[PDB]
Amino acid sequence: MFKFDKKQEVFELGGVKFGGQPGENPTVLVSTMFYARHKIVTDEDKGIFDRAAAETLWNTQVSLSDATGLPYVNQIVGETPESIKRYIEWFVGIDDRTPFLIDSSAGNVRAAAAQYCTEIGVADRAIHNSINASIEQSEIDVLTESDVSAAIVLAFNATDPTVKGKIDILEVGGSGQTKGMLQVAKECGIKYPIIDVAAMPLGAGSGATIRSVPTLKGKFGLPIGGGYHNMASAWDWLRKFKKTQPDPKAIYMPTDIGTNLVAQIAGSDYLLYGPIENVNQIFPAVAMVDIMLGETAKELGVEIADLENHPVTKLT
Amino acid sequence: MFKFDKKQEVFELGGVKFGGQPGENPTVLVSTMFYARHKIVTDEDKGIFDRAAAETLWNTQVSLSDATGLPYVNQIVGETPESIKRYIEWFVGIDDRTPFLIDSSAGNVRAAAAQYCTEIGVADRAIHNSINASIEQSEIDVLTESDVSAAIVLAFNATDPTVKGKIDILEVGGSGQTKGMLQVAKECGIKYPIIDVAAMPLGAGSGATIRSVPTLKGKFGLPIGGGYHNMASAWDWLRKFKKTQPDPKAIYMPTDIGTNLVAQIAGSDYLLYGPIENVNQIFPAVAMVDIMLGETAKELGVEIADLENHPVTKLT
Amino acid sequence: HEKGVPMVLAP
Amino acid sequence: MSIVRIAPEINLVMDTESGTVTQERKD
């Protein structure tokens, strides 16, 4: 329902176009795999996992994305340098075009993955997912040598839980004075800066998370998204009420999925919707908002990039 | 995620506040009882149902409204003058404060429903649904004689599935009429007009429905809302996809409970969320988007009416 | 009344 | 600062610096 005045930058990462005006491009659906306590993963430290059901969780999303038209991107999550290298090798050995986010909490693991992807030859695909104010000199110095041209700039001001705080860490810089995270990424090789709004938990910064989607998009012009499902998964009241109902999942999923639709109508360009096991419920919901966003685009004056493959025409 | 400059009118019908800036008042979840093929209605023509098993459905919405703070309003659907008269008669005896939309597809019944409400004194609690563009001369006669003061005006421009059509059917009127449907209400004695967006099917004018929510609020200022679940209920692709998967309702519910959340963040003030039997899945999803709206309002400078009973305080 | 933003144009 | 267009018909528009949904003045 928006049409930003600031010209929106479209980045093409292995065929998945990040960014654009709301309705121009179908919503990207990043899908977390090999996360904490994934059923397939048996040895969380040596990265063993099933490797047979892992394909089944990835072929499901491809078929759904070929029915809905929404782009699909994987988010490989690892905890140790050996584990993350094991997942990238498998993923690149099954899919040859779809990008991935090498996600990890520890800095030394993300740098190892970013360095490893350079040696394997697939580093135009890596979307290495951290440029945050809590970045050490060790990680920036290895990310500069690695051939990773895309990164998820996380707009997380611990000190300032406001929308202005999200802007300042990107433009001016907060804790870790000067060299804002949008300007650290340029000097570490990142050519396609993708912004993350750093979804804060419900009741503390959850209002600034949704108002930052049309704010940082209309100020910087770069693609905007984030893990909005964390707002609902970290809700204390819902956990208590959910466990009393006969079907705990049927009460939680509309709330968890709704965090993405609410932020998608605001202008979000990609959606970290969480575990890949929830692929059958997020695609119909997100594709429903893309029909809605794909109609105001044809009314406000936006030019849809490829009408024959948009959810507004594939569906309906 | 935004505040409106045009001073929003707030209508207090029977202890429920319709209107206000986004986040000022909690969303008014409007259920729907005695609808087509309700499992409790045995004799649809005569209005004979299971009175003991219907009070349990209502008391489920009453108890969950006290936990989340979201106000609730009934919508007594009926298709014969006798049926809707017994439905209204039952409802007012079990609860004495909550308003009720006297909804019907046949103008004769709404004519009969309006007379009965003023006959037994419960008329300030009755919302006439709806004053559409097809209202006949007889329906105006009974409505203006009655004591019904609040009614829902349907922003339906038949040959104009666009935002400008919805504005024009309220401002200047459409085809077959000479006065705007927002001024026909005034001469009908409706002191409290409540605009309905008249949500259209997906792929045939659904984007204009969501973009009229912040347009018919920033142009008129009257309470805005409607039944958005009709967009996901009329979706042919979802009706086909959801059958292939083992649980048809596991996939359809996040989409059906996503139409309300998308429109709620866009400025909607009440949600005709459909059958009453979905209370346990709509309230957690809607109260979540009301915490998001109650946070920007506290940060954008909007004053909240009753902060103690807001979802931003009870559920955080 | 309730006014609004001015029309941002370019020279 | 972004004049986010949501309704060119009634001239309605957002104002991202203040968060308001105002109406662009032709004056």
Residues in chain D with CB shorter than 8 Å from the CB of C8 are: 3
CA distance A56 to chain B (A): 15
> Which technique was the structure solved with, according to the deposited record?
cryo-EM
Which domains does chain A carry?
11-314 (3.20.20.20)
A242, A245, A258 ranked by CB distance to B258: nearest: A258
Identify the chains in contact with B, defined as 3+ C-beta pairs within 8 A. A, C, D
Q: Across the B/C interface, how many CB contacts are shorter than 8 Å?
A: 5
B257 and A262 in contact by Cβ < 8 A? Answer: no
* Tokens encoding B92: 């007012």
Q: What is the number of structural domains in chain D?
A: 1
Q: Are B104 and B110 in contact (CB under 8 A)?
A: yes
Closest-approach residue (CA) in chain B for D15: B2
Among candidate residues A271, A292, A302, A307, the one with its CA nearest the CA of residue A8? A302
CA distance D26 to chain A (A): 17
Full DSSP string of chain B:
--EESS---EEEETTEEEE-SBTTB--EEE--BS-TT-TTEEETTTTEE-HHHHHHHHHHHHHHHHHH---EEEEB--SSHHHHHHHHHHHHHH-SS--EEEE-SSHHHHHHHHHHHHHTT--TTEEEEEE-TT--HHHHHHHHHS---EEEEE---TT--SHHHHHHHHHT--SS-SS-HHHHHHHTT-SEEEEE-----TTSSHHHHHHHTTTTTTTT-S-EEE--HHHHHS-HHHHHHHHHSS-HHHHHHHHHTTHHHHHHHTT--EEE---GGGHHHHHHHHHHHHHHHHHHHHHHTPPPS-STTSHHHH--
Residues in chain B with CB shorter than 8 Å from the CB of D14 are: 2
Q: Is A258 part of the contact surface with chain D (CB cutoff 8 Å)?
A: no
Residues in chain A with CB shorter than 8 Å from the CB of D8 are: 300-301
Task: Give me the phi and psi of A7, to 5 degrees please.
Answer: -65, 125
* Tokens encoding B217: 């609020």
Which segments of chain A does DSSP mark as H helices, in order?
Answer: 53-68, 81-94, 107-120, 137-145, 163-171, 181-184, 206-211, 213-220, 229-233, 236-242, 248-266, 279-300, 311-314
Which residue's structure tokens are 């072929």? A59
Which of B:153-182 have CB within 8 Å of A?
A: 162-163
Helix axes of B51-68 and B279-300: crossing angle, nearest 10 degrees = 30
Identify the chains in contact with D, defined as 3+ C-beta pairs within 8 A. A, B, C
Torsion, CA B133, CA B135, CA B140, CA B144, rounded to 10 = -60
Q: What resolution in angstroms, rounded to 1 decimal?
A: 3.2
Q: Which residues pair with B28 in a beta bridge?
A: B270
Torsion, CA B237, CA B242, CA B243, CA B247, rounded to 10 = 180
Torsion, CA B145, CA B147, CA B151, CA B157, rounded to 10 = 0
Residues in chain A with CB shorter than 8 Å from the CB of D3 are: 5
For D16, the domain range is: 1-27
CA distance B264 to chain A (A): 8
CA dist list (Å): A168 to A155, A219, B307: 9, 12, 30
Amino acid at A167: I
Rounded Cα distance, A203 and B299, in Å: 12
B17: left (phi over 0), alpha (psi -120 to 50) or beta: beta
Amino acid at B212: S
Q: Which of B5, B217, B219, B220 to mutate to test the interface with C (most CBs of C within 10 A)?
A: B5
A16: left (phi over 0), alpha (psi -120 to 50) or beta: beta
Q: Are A26 and A291 in contact (CB under 8 A)?
A: no
